[PDB]
Amino acid sequence: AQISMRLYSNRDRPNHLGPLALERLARVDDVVAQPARQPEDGFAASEDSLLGDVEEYARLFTRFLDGPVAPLGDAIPDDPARRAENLKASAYFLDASMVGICRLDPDDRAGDCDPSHTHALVFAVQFGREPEAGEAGAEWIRGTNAARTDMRCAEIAAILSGYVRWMGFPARGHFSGDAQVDLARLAVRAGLARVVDGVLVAPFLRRGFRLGVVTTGYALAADRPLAPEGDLGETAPEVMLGIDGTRPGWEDAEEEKRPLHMGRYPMETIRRVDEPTTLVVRQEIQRVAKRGDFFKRAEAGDLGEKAKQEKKRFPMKHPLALGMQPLIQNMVPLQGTREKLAPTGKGGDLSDPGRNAEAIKALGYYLGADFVGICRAEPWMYYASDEVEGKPIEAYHDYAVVMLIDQGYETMEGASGDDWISASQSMRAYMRGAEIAGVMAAHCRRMGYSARSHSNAHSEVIHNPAILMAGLGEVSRIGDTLLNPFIGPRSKSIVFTTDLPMSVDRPIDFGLQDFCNQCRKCARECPCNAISFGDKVMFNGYEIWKADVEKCTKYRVTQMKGSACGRCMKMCPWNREDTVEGRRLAELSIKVPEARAAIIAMDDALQNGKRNLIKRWWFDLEVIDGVAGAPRMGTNERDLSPDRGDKIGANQKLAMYPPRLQPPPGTTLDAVLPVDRSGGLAEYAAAETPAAARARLKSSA
Ligand code: B12
Ligand code: SF4
Ligand code: SF4
Ligand SMILES: [Cl-]
Ligand code: NA
């Protein structure tokens, strides 16, 4: 029934080409400049609207369009064609819609622009889809598209300019809200648009778009403008069908037939159940100090000196991740309120919780979420106490809005999972989520409903049980990661809590317990053997495959041949391309139990998980002592591993750290609690089986 996905794989298409067939458009060497403006919204935004909130995050991102420049090291590639590919691939990684590069002339440097800048990276972001007339949340969104899309342009320009600054080259970001150059002119010269009746028109971006620019003296290979008159070739048969793995020409129209609140993926086709597919015993779940998060344990010294020394650095070794850091850290003060608010009367009719749910979903999809779900924020989902002052955390809000951001299939295909780009994949998703949820929570507060977002930089809730209760994933063998039937385990979640009354979603059942029970690929491929090859256990009141969080923490924080790790997400059979056959393999896994073992086995026989060298678009750069250079100890380039054989389930002994082996509630980062590994190993051997738990509970039912 869903026929918008691609027929053809993009496995041989380098990332710098992007998802659109820009290389098949008619181009010429030069065009005559003419006056032009960016697309704008058709209607005006009310005070019920989100406008003030996206404007605030744009202003925040504006502070990072310029910054300090690092010292130039010895490891930046000289070739401007290679530089151009890398930087275009970077923009597409950050979800630019269309990217091009041009030279800056003297008339461009005659304004406030740095006279050393000779090149411009120009990118467009397409307008978001908006709800139709009469749909829930239409008043929240109408008239906000240029400001919403400007926000995303500032964000991307700030990250990319900061990335070039960390490589040792001055660079400045620009967008409508703060520009030293003529954006519309540069968009024409870089080949993204043409002028129609004084307004820019971009092939393929039929909803409208906004522009961002990074100017720099980092020399880049330039592009050519579009042929100025006549048909560009956007509906040629190779383009329409997406032969090279590009977006099919009918996808826009087909997508617009789904209500915005339903998302892009057909989650309405997955079975719902009232209780999760795995046992949750709420009366037996103890709340955990934030100080027990194993990154906080590492920071405090619980895992030894090396882990402590590397804690702040480990995800910020690559210059691209360093470009994101300022945005991530400075969104934290904007996360929101814990105190009750009074309804303000803004936001339209909020009396139907079913419609409030649809409005919130539409809002998340508009802003860029891949999935949106809603659950009750149960008290046991909040941490017991904060790690800084040690004060109790209250269960202050009623609902959790959970959103998933796809970490990116095509980048992960090129990667080892634990190489130089790994943490940049995590941070992009963390950054994008934090932005979306910050805006959404601010809108709730505008309507007089208390709301706070919960980011990688500062959460007061554990995301996992909210992902489970919101019906966005099932418990997987990976352990501390939940798996979605369409994007697999390839996601970062963001949560914001709120008091806005909403209908809640239900847990999902797509057969994963049976599937993971017959598969061991993640376990086999984990560089530190942290994933369980055995059966599910009870842990702090719930059934789970408990990974060894001490082993995984130490590997991610301290391994030196990349930046952190997410290899388990890469190796999973459910991590697949968004094509007709890929979707079909997932459908079969869901609908046909007798096919699962074959799918599991063929995933290895066909070498899924092999590194695709065409997709390796990033530079292997490690910042040490403030300077980018070649990796000091090398780079992980892992391939598929052989079996551990047949008895590994019975032989592997992992350590678990339920509340009794954690720093108690009220413990702060000022105290040290050496991790009790021998006790955690014994605790795992003593864990109740889920069968025994069900038997025990039944005797009190
Ligand atoms: C610290 C941390 C880690 C640490 C330490 C985890 C720990 N247990 O201390 C380590 C290094 C192990 C880790 C690893 C990774 N993590 Co991590 N991490 C966190 C973080 C920031 C805090 C977790 C926490 O507080 N743990 C301390 C206590 C609560 O741990 P716990 O008692 O052992 O409980 C864990 C689970 O059992 C589960 N949980 C708790 N209560 C309940 C109840 C039920 C019913 C269920 C089903 C589960 C569940 O949540 C906890 C996750 O650590 C969260 C984000 C967040 N705020 O939740 C993510 C988070 C869990 N990580 C995530 C991911 C993706 C990863 C990696 C894949 C790394 C990467 N490249 O992205 C790996 C996966 C490791 C694995 N095998 O599963 C995602 C998972 C998303 C998803 N799809 O489910 C999260 C939610 C971050 C995010 N916003 O997306 N991470
Ligand atoms: S790799 Fe196999 S076992 Fe591990 S999570 Fe994916 S499907 Fe489950
Ligand atoms: S469990 Fe940790 S170390 Fe193992 S693959 Fe996953 S992220 Fe890497
Ligand atoms: Cl994590
Ligand atoms: Na795969």
Numbering used by the authors: -3 to 697
Task: Pull verbatim passages from the article behind this deposition.
The asymmetric unit (AU) contains three monomers that are very similar, with a pairwise alignment rmsd of 0.115–0.148 Å. An overlay of the crystal packing of both NpRdhAC and NpRdhAN reveals the relative position of molecules B and C is particularly affected by the distinct position of the affinity tag, the direct consequence being reduced mobility for these molecules and associated improved diffraction in the case of NpRdhAN. A comparison of the NpRdhAC and NpRdhAN structures by alignment of respective chain A monomers yields an rmsd of 0.148 Å over 614 residues, confirming the distinct position of the hexa-histidine tag has little effect on the protein structure. Furthermore, alignment of active site residues from NpRdhAC and NpRdhAN show excellent agreement with an rmsd of 0.092 Å for the 10 residues selected. A chloride ligand, likely derived from the purification buffer, is modelled as the β–axial ligand at a cobalt-chloride distance of 2.6 Å.
The reductive dehalogenases (RDases) are key enzymes in organohalide respiration, which is performed by a unique subset of bacteria. The RDases are cobalamin-dependent and able to selectively cleave carbon-halogen bonds through reduction. Structural insight into RDase function is based on two enzymes that have been crystallised, the respiratory perchloroethene (PCE) Sulfurospirillum multivorans reductive dehalogenase (PceA), and the catabolic reductive dehalogenase from Nitratireductor pacificus pht-3B (NpRdhA).
